[PDB]
Design a protein around this ligand. Structure first.
Ligand SMILES: OC[C@H]1O[C@@H](O[C@H]2[C@H](O)[C@@H](O)[C@H](O[C@H]3[C@H](O)[C@@H](O)[C@H](O)O[C@@H]3CO)O[C@@H]2CO)[C@H](O)[C@@H](O)[C@@H]1O
Ligand SMILES: OC[C@H]1O[C@@H](O)[C@H](O)[C@@H](O)[C@@H]1O
Ligand SMILES: [Ca+2]
Ligand SMILES: [Ca+2]
Length: 605
């Protein structure tokens, strides 16, 4: 039996990617707390750029890492389809890759034009709230011959190509369509050379630090596998000699790892696996050695607990990416000592993330012992006041998400949501992690959970009305009502709401003498009352036009003060909506709130 149920982890990892979806979600939606969002994406340029994945705990759709995530997720399903089948997650992986690839198609309106971003990084990060009510404008950026971007283009090609191998047998027509787009994106990237971050305002988040030389080899190798065209392998091997060397030596870089920006390290193992040439084997060896025993006395930092800490930001992601590529190389190299080393290194790094560490706690939200409960994620938090501090705990469990984890070699970590350096999540954090789990499920096994995902239930009323007696009176009843929208299953707009306050006409009160006034009302103040039947009448407050959404202090509520004066004889004790209303603001169950005519709160007479 496995040390950790790698099949449950993998199963929850695919749920992650479904909670990161954007655009109009399907009927089969498994995440009950997610709704339609980013529905006007592309409007500014006249295209439909809806769909895709939000990058991290934010809502900007960054195309560079989103492409990488797709290639790593595919690569792992090509190395170990059996792993995805055993855990029962193959139909989900295919559902996720299809979701992101459909977007890469939408975003490629013509051969040499690719949309690589939707959303401004600064405008987006200034607001903390659910993605279903994003109030800011989201610009769309692109790269074309006028301002090229070989790195993001060759990666989107590598992604669509690597994915076509997954759909090849299931949907041969769809597979062909991806290979086609992929060819055009690689030609565009080779013909028009450039760094995408010089053309789109993403340099402060996903800047092209390594350049495109790595994505030209990476992109070619994948078109080679998808098409079988030997010219592509020729192209990959040729471009391989221009990869970044290190500091002063002619040795190719070996001190980092493969991540959304540098694919050099993947090509070391990929070409070595394909050709078997000593040239590549040496590189893959020097790289993976620096992460295990070391080279020339230098070794990646390690914490007393057994974690490989490469950098502060997203440490576990880096160690997870190496753990996957190490398991793939462990199968192609013949050396028994090296094979054992790389394999053991990989299982240890994944086991650390799943719970085998000094804290004995998991680092995958929703999985294991003492998992994180508050990652830096806006929609999972469910804030309704534009605050990262309120509510205290995230209102949703983002099952499957791998957090940053310890950023220093001391195994320390604090579940603080305001720590985007160690407690943030992202599509590429689970990319290499997922590929490893698939490789570990095939080898060590595991069993998925039958009843998954659990169905969450709201933490109280979502859209309701609170009320209280503003000023005591015997000839009038002055109420202070407050509409609230603190929804999160999913968060929704309330732009066409009205509410009724029922009352019973009393002896002596001429309904013609009833007046409804206010000294403060953010909605409309009515002139007359409406007769239902008999002595039953109602006052209707109209708030249609006001956008009440969970996204700010004054944005989520509307205060309505209104006095219903009837003159002497007025008696509120026999009024329906008066039941329960006191001197403290508390939900009023007998004031009915309607959304476009449909009741959402309260019970009518
Ligand atoms: O020069 C050292 C290696 O750096 C690699 O680029 C990394 C950047 O140096 C690093 O600052 C950046 O950190 C990102 C992080 O990856 C991302 O998850 C987070 O959201 O934002 C951080 C800041 O943008 O990561 C990149 C990629 O690992 C080079 O790619 C590598 O060649 C080079 O040796
Ligand atoms: O830019 C640094 C960080 O800023 C935060 O406000 C965003 O929500 C994070 O997603 C981002 O990583
Ligand atoms: Ca690169
Ligand atoms: Ca009455």
């Amino acid at each position: 039996e496995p040390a950790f149920n790698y099949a449950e982890a993998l199963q929850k990892s695919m749920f992650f990617y479904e909670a990161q979806r954007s655009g109009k979600l399907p009927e089969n939606n498994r995440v009950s707390w997610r709704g339609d969002s980013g529905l006007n994406d592309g409007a500014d340029v006249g295209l439909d750029l809806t769909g895709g994945w939000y990058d991290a705990g934010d809502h900007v759709k960054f195309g560079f890492p989103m492409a990488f995530t797709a290639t790593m997720l595919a690569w792992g399903a090509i190395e170990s389809p059996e792993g995805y089948i055993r855990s029962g997650q193959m139909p989900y992986l295919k559902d996720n890759l299809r979701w992101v690839n459909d977007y890469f198609i939408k975003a490629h309106p013509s051969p040499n034009v690719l949309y690589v971003q939707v959303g401004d990084g600064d405008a987006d990060h200034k607001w903390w709230g659910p993605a279903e009510v994003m109030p800011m404008e989201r610009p769309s950026f692109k790269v074309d011959p006028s301002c090229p971007g070989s790195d993001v283009a060759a990666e989107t090609a590598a992604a669509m190509a690597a994915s076509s191998i997954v759909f090849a047998d299931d949907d041969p027509a769809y597979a062909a369509t991806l290979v086609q787009h992929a060819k055009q994106l690689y030609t565009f990237a080779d013909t028009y050379r450039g760094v995408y971050s010089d053309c789109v305002p993403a340099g402060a988040f996903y800047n092209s630090w390594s350049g495109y030389q790595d994505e030209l080899v990476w992109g070619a190798y994948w078109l080679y596998k998808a098409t079988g065209d030997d010219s592509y392998l020729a192209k990959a091997e040729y471009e391989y000699d221009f990869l970044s060397t290190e500091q002063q030596t002619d040795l190719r870089s070996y001190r980092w790892t493969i991540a959304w920006d540098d694919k050099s390290y993947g090509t070391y193992v990929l070409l070595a696996k394909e050709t078997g040439k000593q040239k590549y084997i040496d590189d893959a060896n020097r790289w993976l050695d620096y992460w295990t025993v070391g080279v020339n006395g230098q070794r990646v930092p390690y914490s007393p607990g057994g974690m490989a800490v490469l950098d502060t930001w997203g440490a576990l992601r880096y160690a997870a990416n190496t753990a996957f590529v190490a398991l793939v190389y462990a199968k192609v190299i013949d050396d028994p000592v090296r094979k054992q080393r790389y394999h053991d290194f990989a299982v240890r790094q994944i086991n650390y993330a799943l719970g085998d560490n000094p804290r004995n706690s998991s680092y995958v939200v929703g999985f294991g012992n003492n998992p994180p409960r508050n990652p830096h994620h806006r929609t999972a938090h469910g804030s309704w006041t534009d605050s990262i501090a309120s509510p205290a705990e995230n209102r949703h469990v983002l099952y499957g998400a791998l957090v940053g984890g310890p950023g220093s070699p001391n195994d320390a970590y604090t579940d603080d949501r305001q720590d985007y350096v160690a407690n943030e999540v992202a599509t590429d954090y689970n990319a290499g992690f997922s590929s490893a789990l698939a490789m570990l499920v095939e080898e060590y096994g595991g069993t998925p959970l039958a009843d998954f995902p659990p169905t969450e239930e709201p933490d109280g009323p979502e859209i309701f009305v609170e009320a209280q007696i503003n000023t005591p009176g015997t000839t009038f009843t002055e109420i202070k009502a407050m509409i609230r929208n603190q929804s999160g299953w999913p968060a929704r707009m309330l732009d066409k709401g009205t509410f009724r306050y029922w009352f019973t006409l009393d002896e002596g009160v001429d309904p013609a003498d009833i007046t409804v006034s206010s000294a403060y009302n953010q909605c409309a103040t009515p002139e007359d009352v409406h007769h239902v039947s008999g002595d039953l009448y109602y006052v209707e407050i109209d708030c249609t036009g006001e956008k009440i959404f969970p996204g700010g202090q004054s944005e989520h509520r509307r205060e309505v003060q209104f006095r219903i004066a009837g003159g002497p004889g007025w008696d509120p004790s026999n009024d329906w909506s008066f039941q329960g209303i006191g001197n403290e603001l508390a939900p009023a169950p007998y004031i009915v709130l309607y959304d476009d005519g449909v009741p959402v709160w309260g019970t009518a007479p």
